[PDB]
Structure formats: structure tokens, C-alpha cells
Design a protein around this ligand. Structure first.
Ligand SMILES: N[C@@H](Cc1ccccc1)C(=O)O
Ligand SMILES: N[C@@H](Cc1ccccc1)C(=O)O
Lengths: 318, 589, 589, 508
């Protein structure tokens, strides 16, 4: 052919003096993924943790610290009025340490009040009428739930000159010796929210929950009675889904029992409500997943991460 | 999560209605229960033997109901039916009265040899039970149900049911040397000794647990009677002589154990549950238990507590404003027979021995709300203004995360647990110089220790992503545990920002450059003078010599910057060389 | 921000005390004022005009006080001193009464030729003023102060002060043809005509403004008297015959204008301010103004309003809980003479004609709080719980920003205004096809139109950063305006995400790849058979032919993807080629 | 001649030796100390994996300069005990000399002596007990007997910090022969290929040791503009304080909403050609709330709602004039009006950060268009104190506590106050924000209830950003003239935009 020795991309000199004009070059495959620009990446699960953290802040909640993968049995259990007969304080369920076996320092006064009400009762309750062994509470372990963190937080609060209502939240990792599985792992992330004021009602707990799951884009909300060792009334919240074409549990909550709170020193006119869920569940659905080990852990498929989108363009009109 | 299987057709018949698989799944929800699953006996084993089509009682459909580990009066069909029945006011709640018998004031005597192995025990009898194929199995089931559950595998409380027509005269509870009691146990051919059964059971799949987990002391609990017949050896097995079968007329129930009140309760549950089948319905025949103390107390003590609650409390706590008269109605449907006390202010509540879960005022509120139906409670929103605040550290973290990403790196999610070799041997150091924390009786090998660094996990990630393009640039900003003699628990978490460069050539200069950016981001000037930071060449057993440095800033060692040593990179089954970086962002707040 | 210069030593003497440069700066703060600076004309003329070091009464120590454009009774020393004096209860607030003279009921008549150039006017006189070097200048200053300020450069109201001893008999306010009035103006040698002064003033640095900005109508305002002497030509200049100097004994003040009430106020301020210097202190001699209407009204009308406010209100509004008796004291110190009304509930407040700013109940609260001292009010926190919510768009934007950064690009801050050629000519399109909005009488050329795209600004940024490394990767996610016939205002803003690649070679494939990432981020699948997006080659007068495409998604054109055309890249004075991208992220919400 | 010269020489030696070699001995055998041989061995390890070396160490106990004295003249406590008779010893003189002073503090923390204040001669010291045994001394007295072991770890422990003796550890090095061993030294081996890892070839060569002095290579990270990085932080503060973000998609506002709606009189100067950019094209608003407008026109000229208006003639043709939003307050007017239409009133908290346009060629940073953030709270019975309270909470999450309020003026606020803060470095109370309490003649005509009152405050995104990233002029990053390099380097002004940031050292 004639004038057909096409060129490549334009040039700074062609742009300098008329050269680009007629030196024929029109080749560009307008149907190709082009070159994804090299880009940094944030892990999907944490992109989500971020979104939760925000929801909490927008709802006036303060972020409580969780720097302690290792909790003493006292704070992780006893403190939450979790008897010692319970099947969750067993070796086959929890990770107890081998090296720092027993903890070192413990809040003996508070511990005394617990030991007490735990076995003999008080504050209006009739305890569990069993013998509370301190050597047991001394046993160190791997925090089994963020609720312990709240116990801490509340206790600290109970010491403030005059009481002052608050709203705490925290999204932290929690170790469980459950069962090496494909559905659930050994360690996951659990988010918890707690409100402490005067005269909070089960309805409040419900009201807050509705507001929370709305900023998560959920309206099909139905509550159901449940049981938690550390909550006067306790309820599991559910939502409807098409995936299992029927109702599903999306969160557990309750109203800390007074035999948990009163011994910390909080006033009797103060009541605190709380709720919690796992960072995992909401992702393993609102992003469709088969194996959890696919995004949590070293076995993670990095390619999936590179491609993970704005896991926050979620609670928006999807 | 206690589960209770029940023959459907029976359950429905028991109630007095027929339910849709939805209608009931609903009723369950409405009462705090959950209809876990619906199967047949054949389907139940249709996977534990392949498919050995077992036909018989596998034709019947049964509901697998889940019940709260709180409510004990719901561990058998008799109970669930009674509970739901009153809950829907389809029946008045029955009253349990214990009566005196006609002279046969059965009595069980506790001795001194007792208090030190199973301190106390309690018993009672229920006259003329009309048993049944099912009623029997249910009675046995309940027994097992609350055994390895509320009794903690008999550890605290152990229950024994006997056929009172097959023995007589005052019974005795005591303890003798193991090799000092002949016996004809439940499912055993001959007649053995205590000292003999113990080891012949170490092979019994079922009792393999209960035994040693409770006995190996100088004495063994035993229960005799006038004749001298052995009733049972409390925690392990009962006597085959006094065995109880479908045709039993009178049952003598005994409960021994280390926890008084619990035993006392277990008894009440059993006896209160099945007295529905006694000739004199809902009646338990008293029994006299005599303690080493020499005193005699009557049992069971069907405790009927009568606390009082201000209707206002229930309202103000649940979040409803119903009238005291109606509040009482609610509570009643829940077994707690309530009645308003004149000035329509206070409500008198009667706590049945069946609901032993009610231990505090708040527990009444629970039941009250459950009876009222959670979804009938209007959702209100707490009106207390509070200014939100992030936790300093986490705020900073969240920021750095966003810039690491800007700097082209990709965030991972390492596990916090692993094997010692992951944070020691594979890095060229002994597990004794890591300050690491050790987990007791770890399942797998990768549950021995808790992270001491993020480098391992990061590498392991690369290992699993060999399939990924040219240079891998990973990073993570998480916690690592260390033993700290100055913390109430004994260990402390630290926030490390750790990154790695994986490529044909290690990017030690580009990694060095990352640290520079990071510092630039944190507004930390370089050099020893300007109160900033310094890279001081150093040596590390995990880094290729002469390509390793230490980071110093704000008056202390922050981290280690360097090129991974060929040994570690191969011991983590990797190909290319590697440049790392790991600073403790803590001091930078 | 009205500023008032005052001879310090005089100010202090006026008050009756001596103040530290802090003590007074404090008193200022305490009263809502601000002591802007302390210098003199030794700093004025000595900074912009050669250096006329003329100091004999100029170079002094005077305070440059800032006063609220609200309070008019504070534009002269007489006022500030009076105000602060009462504020610190160092003096009782003076009362302004207007009195009748001895027969000499001066009168000013308005005619018909009036209503159409300066509708109304008002006047009054103040007998026997004891002027002074300073008092005079202050009197003249105030005149200027409230002229080119509250009168809007005489536009609405114009004030004229005359020496009543130099003219007599009833005065007349009217309008005649320009070339129909001889006159001997203030600082003018001869005697000119109206039609003559107008243009001889177009050169007068001071009046260069006032004139035409108000007159060029068929008539000109003028004020005569019995003798036929010309008092003044209202907005422009006054008569030199009736000029007022230090030795003047009686002043006749007249105010003409388009805004009745304002003039009425300006008068009151002037007369109420300086009647402090009349023989019969704080007295203004009435004056009869006769309107075209034929009616006669007396002036000035030293209005004394008497509204009533409840004490609880002030407290509940300010945030203090003082007693009504004390509240009254507060209000009084602020000029608003208050008194409690028996049942210590309501407070009767007397609004002086000086504080004409008090127009609503809330204005009393202001003064009340100011008197009480803002910093004595306890800070309280509103207790209403509210859940926060971001604006959908902005949330998304904030996200994209963070990923654009992750993708190695750098965010800029383009201005929203620019020159037409920036969004048309330089891009190969006529300003008539941009739908752009045009700014009226724009200062510079780069204030003609409002952005229609972010591409221009971005380029212009590269232009100013030639000094920057190899490839420049810029982006910005902001608004652009467009005319929209379907919006209450006429225009609408759009959120475009716009990026550019500047390098030796255009990165049209890497820019194409950016769009792909962005879509991937927004979870928008490629291809249309799923409501996604596609690239359809197209032509653009800003893109090099055959290297330009259009972006389609969610059923519409989103943006333009392409390589900038050599013309635009040179017309923006750039070197290398360029690849751009600009999508309207709006539809993606 | 210190490392490279004693290196090629320590290699010669190893070559000529039978394996073993000491950096001490062979340094004694040399005319060189041990800060040369060892100082070098360092290089012979950096240079790849040439020679192996083992850091052996000698550990013996010596006595202090101080403790050598004690060791012979007794401790300081015993020193003083014996020095004080039973007759007492005024503690005045006792501590009027360092040697004593010290010993007094320990004759005390020993219960060997006590004080008093019962003798005109000021406080005095008397010995408590009469039995003295100098442990401190008679313990050292033997440590220097070459018996520094007959003592407990519990003992020398305390003794150590008492400066009564120290431990000496002589570090010796046992440089062997490794692999890379060779006197060739051709450190031309630059890096570490994936090959060498799988083979072992990292052992047969010397790698040019890295120059840990020079800075590294900053990666090509993407960047977010400093001003917006700050906008982000503000946006967050507002959300954490329960405020909802109101929309601002409208650079072009009708004069009505911008001025009239806010009860800012028509003949106000601020709506002059010199002050506000008006429009040439959509110069006339195509629509507006005539009902609301009527109520405005009304109260604006005749008054009402308790006010006496401005008593002037309100021209509608004026309000119709389109312009470039001069302040975000107009956005709030919109927002509030909308709110006023809600079935039952409901308290709220709005905020918005958007750019405004002012014509002024004004002094200060010459910007005709800058960002302005505004916060508004509308509830029942809000007081000036609430406005203050909220402001304190806000400026605290901004890291500011020196807060002082001052009266001010805004056409649209009953009381109005400017809030200030005392600057440390730039000593002087600088501003920081203007606020007020919307007048009812602004609110009531919108249709809000009379029992509702709304307070608001605002400031510019520019002013603070200038004092956070630290600058004096902002036209340095606001515009096309922005110095991109400054952006690339802009640090996290977040933790360094609330928490306490560190300023360069002050060496003298
Ligand atoms: N994560 C906690 C939250 C919670 C606290 C207290 C009661 C109920 C729920 C849980 O699962 O229990
Ligand atoms: N809009 C003003 C602040 C302000 C608004 C409304 C009332 C009071 C103050 C500003 O941005 O400076």
C-alpha cells in the first residue's frame, strides 16, 4: 500500500512542530482491559472493619482500647458473672496459656466482691451457690470474646467521681479453640457496642440496634429471646435474606445483669445494654464467599484482594 | 445448647393440636426455643454407617428442639409440653405438693465416711408411676440430659433411680475401700468389686470418662439397704438388682454429690417433671434423709419462693407500660404465678421449683418481656448526647494503613497464633530468646505460640501466593504479644507496622525508602541530632549480613530494617530474596 | 468594620481616667470593641506618599478603635466616651429632649420637583454649640463616618450642616434644571452652575464618586432660603456661604435622601451626639419640615420606644439565671434604661433614640449578655441525641479519593473560576457550546466563567510544575457548573473525577486502565448486558483523533476518555503529550 | 590503616594459621590494640560471609573508685554513726558536708540514728541503737581479696547501684575461616540473585556491604491534597459530634437565599459589585418559594414576628439576581427552611464544608474563592452557653483549649460572638471562629416554631490549615500554582492535626 507505515503513540516533538499531522498512525484496540495502573491495596475484611468503626463513631460511640490478646480468667469470665461450672471455661473450648499461666496483679477488692456475690449472692441475687476458687480465676488465657474488654471499660467507669453516661465500642480479634473448620476459624474479629445510662430499657437496646443495622443497610429486623450468662433479658436480632430464603441471626445482645455491674461499683440507678457480632459473617455474604480461609489468614488469595472494591459503597443505595 | 428430640406425632398429641412445620417453628421462636432440625432415626445414622438402612422407629419424624441452658424444666417432652401449654394459656399451671406416705417413710442415712468424697446426697420417691415405652425413654433421657450438663458430667451431682419394689428397709449412703464391695452392675454379666470395675471400665466408651475424673480416693460412695443389697456406687454405675424398667411401679430417686443445692435442684426437676405420671398426679412422696450430723431433713423440698416486685419496675426495665393486673397475667403464663397486692402497685410472684433459674429480680423481667412478646415492645432511642472519640493508636493506624496503600503496598491478614519454629528456629533464634507466650495443650502445631512479629505470617502469605506477579509488596499493621513482668496479666501487645519486598532482587533500598516515607508521614526528622530517627547498621540472625540495620527514634529502638537471610527465605519455602521492615509504631503517638 | 481614631490623651481626659495600653485594650474587648492599632499620621502619610514628615499636630498618640457596623452612636469620640461611660456606670445616661425655640421656628419646605430624585428630607437645629479645634474635627469626622457608611456613600441619605447665622428666613428644598443654578461651593474659587460643576468634578478625587453615581436626572436637589441664598446641592456639595467653622454658634442640620427612616436616623445620631456641646446641654431645637403633601411635621423626632420583655426570657435565652432586679441593672448600663415591674417578673425597658439597632426582643438579649460579660456565662452542652449521617455523594467521593491515591495519583486543588478560553478556545470549542455560566463585570480575565471541566485547571497545574519528575499523575474529584433550565437557580453542579497522565509518551493505555480500576472499585461490570459500562471510540475536538473514547454506563454517557490533542497541549504551554479521563461520578451513587 | 589495612592483614594471618585466631592475642602480637582488630573484624563480616567469628567474654568483679575508699575507711553510714556521740550531734553541721550528708540518709534508713527538734540548737541527731557492725565495708573488704564470689547475688546486686563496685567484661573475638575467605576482596558482588539462594553461591563470594548512611528510595506513593486532608479531619470531627452532613451542590445561589433569606437587608454593602461576584448569564433565578418569599418581603420591610423590620422597600427584582454563593450560611438557610416543613419539628445538627466566592481583591492571602466550614444546631431552648459549650467541644477535637469569647455582629444572629485562642509561639490571642444565634426574623418566616431556636458557627478551612501544616501564605498550595513537591511531602495532618506533634530539637 501507499502512505501506510503507521506510527505509535504521539510524541513531544511531533507536538513541537506539525510532525504529528500526516505521518499516519490510527491503531488502538478499543475493546481491551487496558493496563490496570499498579495500585496499593487494603484488606477487604479491614475495609469493612473501617466501615463499622465509622458507624459507631457517627452514632456517638467512643472507641475503647483492646491491647491485650491475653486476658486473665477473672476478667474474661468471673467478672462477667460467668460461673465456673460453665462448659465454656473448659480446656476444650478456650486457649489457656502455658507460660504466663497465672496472671500477676488482680483487683482483689473487686475480686472479693465478685467471689462473694458469685457464691453467696447479694445485690439482690442469690448467686450460683457454689464455691468460688480464686486459683481458677488466676488462670491466663486468650481473650475468648471482646465482652471482657467491656467489663474492664465498665469497671474503670464505675470508679469515676460522679457517674457519667457513655457509649463504648470496640472491634477486636478473639481467640477460640472451637474446631479447626471451613465454616469458622480459630481466631476471628468480633465487634461490640455498649451503652450505659440511667433507665435504659429493652426497647432502647432495640432502638439502638435498629439505628445501627440501618447504617448497615438492613430493615427486616425481628428480635428473639435468648440466653447469655451476663444479661438480664437477652435477645438475638434477625433479618430476612434470600440466600437462605428465610430469617437469619445477625447479632446477639442483652442487658448486663446487676450481679455483674453492681459489684464493679456502678450505681443501682444505672443500667447498661450491649450487643455484638462478628466482622466475618457480614463479609462472607455481602461479598459472597465459600471458604473463610480465603480472606482471613496467610492462605488468602491476594488476587481477590487486589480486586476487592469499595466495601463501603455497601450501606449506600447499592 | 441443650437439644431435645421428641416424637413429633407424640408432641402434637401431647399438646392437643397439629402444627405446620412453620406454625411450630414459630411457636418455638415465640418462646425462646429453636427448632434446630427435623429428621428420622434412619437419617440420623444415614451417615455414621454409610447408609445401613435402619428401619423401625426411623419411620417416625421427630423434632430436634434447642432449649436454653438456663431453663431445666425443659429437658424432656413432659416439660416442653407443660411449659408451652401454660405459655399459651391452654392449660392452668400444675402445682407440685410433696405428701407423707402410709408409714413407709423411706429413709436414706448419710455417714461420716461420706463427707470427703461426695459430702451430701438427697432422695425421694414417687408412688405408682404409669410408665410407657416412650414415657420410660423420656424419663431415662432427662436423666442423661441433666447429667452430663447441669451436673457437669455427674462431677457435682449424680442421680440414681431405683425400683423400690426390689429392695427394702432404711438405705445407707457411705464409703468403703474400693476392694471391699461385691456388686452386680447394670449391664455386667457376673458380680465384681469396686476395685475391680474401675479398671474394667477404663475401656468402656461411655463411662471411660466419669470414673477416674471423679474417683481414686481412699473411699468409694455406695448405697445399701436393710437386706444389705447394694443400690449403687453413685457416680459410676447403679445396681442391676434395683434397675428400673417400663413395668416399674414405684421409683426411689437418690442424688449424691459435692454441690448440695444443685443436687437438691436436680431432684426437684426429675420428681416435679414426672410426677405427672403418678397415680396421685403431681405428688411426690416425701423421704427422710439423715445427715452425718444426726439430723433428719425431708425431701424433696419443692421450694416455692414468694418474692415481690413493683409493677413499675418491670415496666421501667422492659420498656412497656402495662397495668400491674396484666403484668401479673404475663408472669403467670411463664410459670411464675403472680397476683397483684391490693394497692395495684406491688406484684407477689411465686417461683416454682421447676424454674430454678430465677435468682434475681431481673430474671422476672426477662420472663415478663418474653411473655409480652419482644416484638410488641416499641423501639425507643436513648436520648443522651455523647461526643465520640477514637482511640489515639487506632486513629494513627487507620491513617498509616491508608498511606501504605498509597505507597503501592498491599495489606494482609496474618493469624495471631502459630508454631514456635515460625518465630524462632526459622528466623535463626531459640524459642527461649523471643519472650514469646506459650499456649497450653495446643491442638495443632500452629497453636503453640502467639506472634512475636508479623514477618513470619507475611512470608507464609507470599508462599501461598507464588502465582502472583513480579514484585510482591505486602504489609500489615497489627499486634504482637510479648511477656511483660510489669502488666497485670503477664504479657503486652505491641503495634508493629511490618512490610516486605519480594522480587528477583531484594529491594533493600526501596524498603529503606519505605521507612523514610513512613517517618516523613509521621513528621519525624532524620539524624541523631534533630530529635528524630537513625538507621544504624546492625546484625540480625534473620538478615543477610551487612544488609541489616536498626531503627532508633524518640529515644529508643523502634525496629529492624534489613534483607532476609537465605536460610529463613528457604525455611519458609520461598524462591526470591527478600527485604523487610518492622517498626513499633507505639512510641510515635 | 467602622474604625474611629481618637486623640488618646483626649480620650482618657474625656473619660476621667488614665488607661494602660492593656487596661483599655481590655475595656474594648469587654464592650465588643477592638483596639485595632496605636500609631499616628506619622505612620499614615509615612508609608504610601513619598515621605511628608509633617508633625506639629499630626504625629501623635491616637487609638485606632474598631466599632460594630451596628452601633451608630459609636462613630465619634463623644459617642464612645458616652457609651463606655454608662457601660461602667461611671455616669448616668443623658436624656435627649427636643425643645421649641423663641419664635425662630426654623422651617424647611419640600416641593413637588423633589419626590423623584430625593423624595424626602428632614432637618433641625442645635443652639449655641461651644465648638473646639477637636470638637469641630470630631463633628466633621462623624459626618463623613456615617456618610460613606450607613448612608451608603450618601446614596440614600445626605447630611448638610449649616451656620444658621449666615442666612435666614424659611428654607426651601426642591429641584431645578442643572444649568439653572449659580453657586459658590465649599472649596471653589468662583461661582459656577450645577450643569457646570458636575463635569468640573469628574476630576475631583473625592467627589469623583458621589456625583454621577446619584445624579444625571432632569432635576437637581437644591436648598434655598428667604434671601434666596443657596444652602447646598444635597448629594454633591454645600454652599460656601453657609459653611460651618470652629467659631460657628448655631448649626442648622438638613438631611435629604431616598430612604426616609435612615435619614431620620442619621439626623438623630448627629444631633443627639453633639447636643452635648449646646448651651442648654442635651437639647435639640425643633424644626418644622413641610412636605409636598402640605403637612408639617416636627424634627428631629427623638424617638423613645418602650417595649416590654419578660426576665425569664433573657435568662432562658442567654443561658444565665440572674434576678430581674439585676437583669434590669445590666440592660441599663447598656443605655436601655430598665426597671422591674412590681411582681419581679417583667422588666420595662426604655429604648433610647441613640440605640436604633434594637428592633426585636432578641436585640435586648444581646445587650443583656454583653453587659453581663460573655465569659461569665457557664458553658453548657445541649443534650439531644442525634445520629450523624454523611451525604451519599461526599462519602463516595471521600472513598474514591483514597483509592486514586492508592493508584499512585496525586490530588490537586483547581480554582472554580477561569477565563472562557480555558474551557473553550483552548479545547477546540466555542464558548457558545459549553453550557458555561458567565460572571458579570469580572475583575480579571480569569473570572469570566465557572469550570465546565477539571481538565483545564489540571493542565495549568502541570504547567506550573515543570520542575516535577518524569510522569505527572494528577487527579481531582470536584464540582463543575452548567446551565440547567430545570433548576430553581438556572445552573447545576456535577461531581467529576478527572485525572491526567503527563509523560514522554501519553499513557492512554494506563489512563484507560485507570478507568477500568475505578469501575472495578465501584463494582460496575464491563459490558452492558448487566448494567455496567463500556468504552465506545468517539471523536473530540480536544483529543488527538483515534485516541479518544466515550464512557457509557447505567444507561448514559458518563465521561470522555482520551489523549489530549497537540493543540490544547501547546495552548496550555505544555511540552509532553497527555492522556486524560473525566467521568461524572454522579450516576454511580 | 585501621580496618582495611588491618583487615587484609588479619586475612593473611588466618591464612597462615591453623584455624584458630584471637582478635586479642593476634592484636598483642601486633603493634595494635583491640579497637583496631575488632573494629575491623566488623568489616570482614559485612563483606559477605568470609570469616566466621565468635564473641567470647571474660567476666571479673572489680571495686569502685568510691568503694575502694569505703573498702578501707568503712562505709559512709558507719563513718557517721561513730562520728555522733550520745551527747547528740546537731544535724545542721552533719549535713554541711557531702561525705556525711549521704551517710546520714543511710544511718537513718537503718534505724541507727534518729532526729529531734527539742534543743534550741536546731534539729539534732542521736544514735538509736548502740551496736554497730559495718556490713557494707566488711563486704567489700573481701571482694577485693579476690573473693568476689563468697558474696550473694542478692548482695552485690544492691551494692552495684550503690556505686560500691562494678563488673568488668572483656570481649574477645575468635575469628575463624568461613567460606568467602580469600584475600582477593572484589566486593563487586552487588546484590543477591534468586539463584544464589537455591544454590549456595552466596557463601562463595563477598557482597559490597551497604552504605547505611545515605537515605533510601522514596516509593511513588499517590497523594492527597493537604487542604483536603484537613477537610477530611473536620468532616470527621463533625460526624463524631453527631452532626449530619448537609448538601452544597450549588456554586450559584439566588440573591434571595444568599442574603434576603438570612434577614441580611437588601441595601447591605456586602451585596455590592465590589464584594460579591454577580452573574451575567443565569442572572435571574428561574424559580423560588414565593410564599416564603412573601413572608420575607413582609417582615423585611414592615416587620412582624416581634420585630420592626428594616422599614425599607423590598424589591423582588433584586432578590432574583443570581450570584456565586458568598458564604455557606445560605446552604443552612436552605437546610433550615426544608426542616421547617417537616410534619412535627425534630431537633437536628447540620454541618457542611464547601467553597464560597468573594470578589474582594482583599489583603491577606489573596483568594477570591476559599473553603468555609459551618456547623448548625437546632433544638428547643438552646442558650448562648450551649453555643459556647458546643464550640469548646469542637475546638478541643481540634486541639485547642485557650478559648475566650467576644461580642460581635452578624446581620443574622440575635447575639453573635467571635471565639479566640491564645497562640503559644505567636504569643497573642488570635481569632479562630465566628458564631451567633440566627435571628427569629430569619427563622420564624421559614415556618419554624417559636419554641425552637438554632445556633451556628463557622470558620475557614484555609486559616487553620496554614497553622497546622505550618505556613504563612496559602496561595502556596491552593490553586494551579500549587507547589506539587510540597504535596508529595505533606505528612499525616491528622494525628498531627489533633494530638501533640513534636517540634525540632533545640541544641545550644
Ligand atoms: N459480643 C458480645 C456482645 C454482647 C454482650 C452482652 C450480651 C450480649 C451480647 C456477645 O456475643 O455476647
Ligand atoms: N458563616 C460564618 C460563620 C457563622 C455563620 C452563621 C452564624 C454565625 C457565624 C463563617 O463561615 O465565618
Amino acid at each position: 500500500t501507499s502512505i501506510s507505515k503507521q506510527e505509535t503513540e504521539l510524541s513531544p516533538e511531533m507536538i513541537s512542530s506539525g510532525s504529528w499531522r500526516d505521518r499516519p498512525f490510527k491503531p488502538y484496540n478499543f475493546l481491551a482491559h487496558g493496563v490496570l495502573p499498579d495500585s496499593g491495596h487494603l484488606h477487604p475484611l479491614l475495609k469493612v472493619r473501617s466501615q463499622f468503626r465509622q458507624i459507631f463513631l457517627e452514632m456517638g460511640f467512643t472507641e475503647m482500647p483492646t491491647d491485650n490478646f491475653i486476658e486473665s480468667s477473672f476478667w474474661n469470665f468471673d467478672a462477667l458473672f460467668q460461673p465456673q461450672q460453665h462448659p465454656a471455661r473448659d480446656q476444650h473450648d478456650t486457649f489457656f496459656l502455658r507460660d504466663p499461666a497465672e496472671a500477676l496483679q488482680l483487683p482483689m477488692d473487686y475480686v472479693q466482691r465478685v467471689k462473694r456475690t458469685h457464691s453467696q449472692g447479694g445485690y439482690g441475687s442469690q448467686g450460683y451457690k457454689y464455691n468460688w476458687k480464686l486459683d481458677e480465676a488466676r488462670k491466663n488465657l486468650l481473650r475468648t470474646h471482646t465482652t471482657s474488654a467491656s467489663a474492664r471499660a465498665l469497671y474503670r467507669l464505675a470508679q469515676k467521681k460522679p457517674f457519667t453516661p457513655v457509649k463504648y465500642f470496640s472491634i477486636d480479634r478473639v481467640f477460640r479453640n472451637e474446631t479447626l473448620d471451613a465454616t469458622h476459624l480459630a481466631e476471628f474479629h468480633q465487634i461490640e457496642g455498649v451503652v450505659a445510662d440511667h433507665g435504659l430499657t429493652l426497647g432502647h437496646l432495640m432502638g439502638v440496634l435498629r439505628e445501627f443495622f440501618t447504617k448497615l443497610g438492613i430493615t427486616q429486623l425481628r428480635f428473639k429471646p435468648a440466653y447469655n450468662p451476663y444479661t438480664e433479658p437477652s435477645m438475638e436480632v434477625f433479618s430476612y435474606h434470600q440466600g437462605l430464603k428465610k430469617w437469619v441471626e445477625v447479632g446477639n445482645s442483652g442487658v448486663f445483669r446487676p450481679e455483674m455491674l453492681l459489684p464493679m461499683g456502678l450505681p443501682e440507678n444505672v443500667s447498661v445494654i450491649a450487643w455484638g457480632l462478628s466482622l466475618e459473617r457480614p463479609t462472607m455474604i455481602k461479598y459472597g464467599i465459600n471458604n473463610i480461609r480465603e480472606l482471613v489468614g496467610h492462605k488468602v488469595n491476594l488476587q481477590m484482594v487486589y480486586d476487592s472494591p469499595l466495601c463501603r459503597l455497601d450501606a449506600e443505595p447499592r | 445448647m441443650p437439644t431435645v428430640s421428641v416424637k413429633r406425632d407424640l408432641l402434637f398429641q401431647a399438646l392437643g393440636r397439629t402444627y405446620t412445620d412453620e406454625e411450630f417453628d414459630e411457636l418455638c421462636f415465640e418462646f425462646g426455643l429453636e427448632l434446630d432440625e427435623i429428621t428420622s432415626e434412619k437419617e440420623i445414622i444415614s451417615k455414621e454407617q454409610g447408609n445401613v438402612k435402619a428401619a423401625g422407629a426411623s419411620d417416625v419424624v421427630l423434632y430436634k428442639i434447642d432449649v436454653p441452658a438456663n431453663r431445666y424444666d425443659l429437658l424432656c417432652l413432659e416439660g416442653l409440653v407443660r411449659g408451652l401449654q401454660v405459655f399459651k394459656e391452654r392449660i392452668k399451671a400444675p402445682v407440685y405438693k410433696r405428701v407423707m406416705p402410709d408409714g413407709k417413710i423411706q429413709k436414706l442415712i448419710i455417714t461420716e465416711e461420706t463427707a470427703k468424697i461426695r459430702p451430701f446426697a438427697v432422695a425421694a420417691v414417687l408412688r405408682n408411676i404409669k410408665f410407657t415405652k416412650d414415657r420410660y425413654d423420656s424419663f431415662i433421657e432427662l436423666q442423661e440430659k441433666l447429667h452430663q450438663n447441669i451436673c457437669r458430667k455427674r462431677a457435682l451431682v449424680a442421680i440414681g433411680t431405683h425400683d423400690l419394689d426390689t429392695l427394702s428397709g432404711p438405705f445407707t449412703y457411705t464409703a468403703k475401700r474400693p476392694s471391699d464391695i461385691k456388686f452386680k452392675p447394670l449391664n455386667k454379666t457376673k458380680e465384681y468389686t469396686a476395685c475391680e470395675l474401675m479398671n474394667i471400665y477404663k475401656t468402656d466408651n461411655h463411662l471411660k470418662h466419669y470414673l477416674h475424673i471423679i474417683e481414686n480416693k481412699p473411699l468409694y460412695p455406695v448405697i445399701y439397704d436393710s437386706n444389705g443389697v447394694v443400690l449403687s456406687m453413685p457416680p459410676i454405675i447403679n445396681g442391676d438388682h434395683s434397675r428400673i424398667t417400663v413395668n416399674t411401679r414405684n421409683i426411689f430417686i437418690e442424688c449424691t454429690g459435692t454441690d448440695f443445692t444443685k443436687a437438691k435442684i436436680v431432684l426437684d426437676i426429675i420428681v416435679t417433671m414426672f410426677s405427672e405420671y403418678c397415680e396421685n398426679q403431681f405428688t411426690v412422696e416425701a423421704a427422710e434423709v439423715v445427715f452425718p450430723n444426726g439430723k433428719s431433713h425431708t425431701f424433696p423440698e419443692l421450694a416455692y419462693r414468694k418474692e415481690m416486685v413493683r409493677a413499675d419496675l418491670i415496666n421501667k426495665k422492659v420498656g412497656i407500660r402495662e397495668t400491674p393486673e396484666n403484668l401479673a397475667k404475663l408472669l403467670t403464663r411463664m410459670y411464675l404465678k403472680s397476683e397483684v397486692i391490693g394497692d395495684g402497685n406491688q406484684i407477689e410472684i411465686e417461683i416454682p421449683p421447676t424454674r430454678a433459674d430465677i435468682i434475681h429480680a431481673c430474671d422476672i423481667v426477662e420472663d415478663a418481656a418474653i411473655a409480652y412478646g419482644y416484638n410488641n415492645i416499641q423501639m425507643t432511642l436513648p436520648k443522651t448526647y455523647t461526643i465520640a472519640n477514637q482511640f489515639p493508636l487506632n486513629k494513627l493506624t487507620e491513617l498509616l494503613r491508608h498511606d501504605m496503600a498509597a505507597a503501592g503496598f498491599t495489606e494482609a491478614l496474618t493469624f495471631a497464633l502459630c508454631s514456635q519454629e515460625d518465630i524462632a528456629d526459622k528466623l535463626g533464634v531459640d524459642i527461649s530468646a523471643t519472650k514469646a507466650v506459650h499456649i497450653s495443650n495446643p491442638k495443632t502445631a500452629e497453636f503453640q505460640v502467639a506472634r512475636t512479629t508479623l514477618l513470619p505470617g507475611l512470608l507464609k502469605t507470599i508462599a501461598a501466593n507464588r502465582k502472583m506477579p513480579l514484585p510482591l509488596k505486602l504489609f500489615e499493621i497489627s499486634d504482637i504479644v510479648i511477656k511483660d513482668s510489669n502488666t497485670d496479666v503477664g504479657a503486652k501487645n505491641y503495634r508493629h507496622l511490618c512490610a516486605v519486598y519480594y522480587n528477583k532482587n531484594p529491594g533493600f533500598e526501596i524498603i529503606h525508602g519505605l521507612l523514610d516515607r513512613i517517618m516523613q508521614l509521621l513528621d519525624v526528622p532524620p539524624g541523631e541530632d534533630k530529635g528524630g530517627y537513625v538507621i544504624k547498621a546492625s546484625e540480625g540472625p534473620a538478615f543477610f549480613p551487612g544488609r541489616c540495620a536498626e531503627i532508633f527514634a524518640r529515644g529508643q529502638s523502634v525496629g529492624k530494617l534489613g534483607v532476609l537471610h537465605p536460610d529463613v527465605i528457604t525455611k519458609f519455602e520461598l524462591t526470591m530474596p527478600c527485604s523487610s521492615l518492622e517498626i513499633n509504631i507505639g512510641p510515635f503517638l
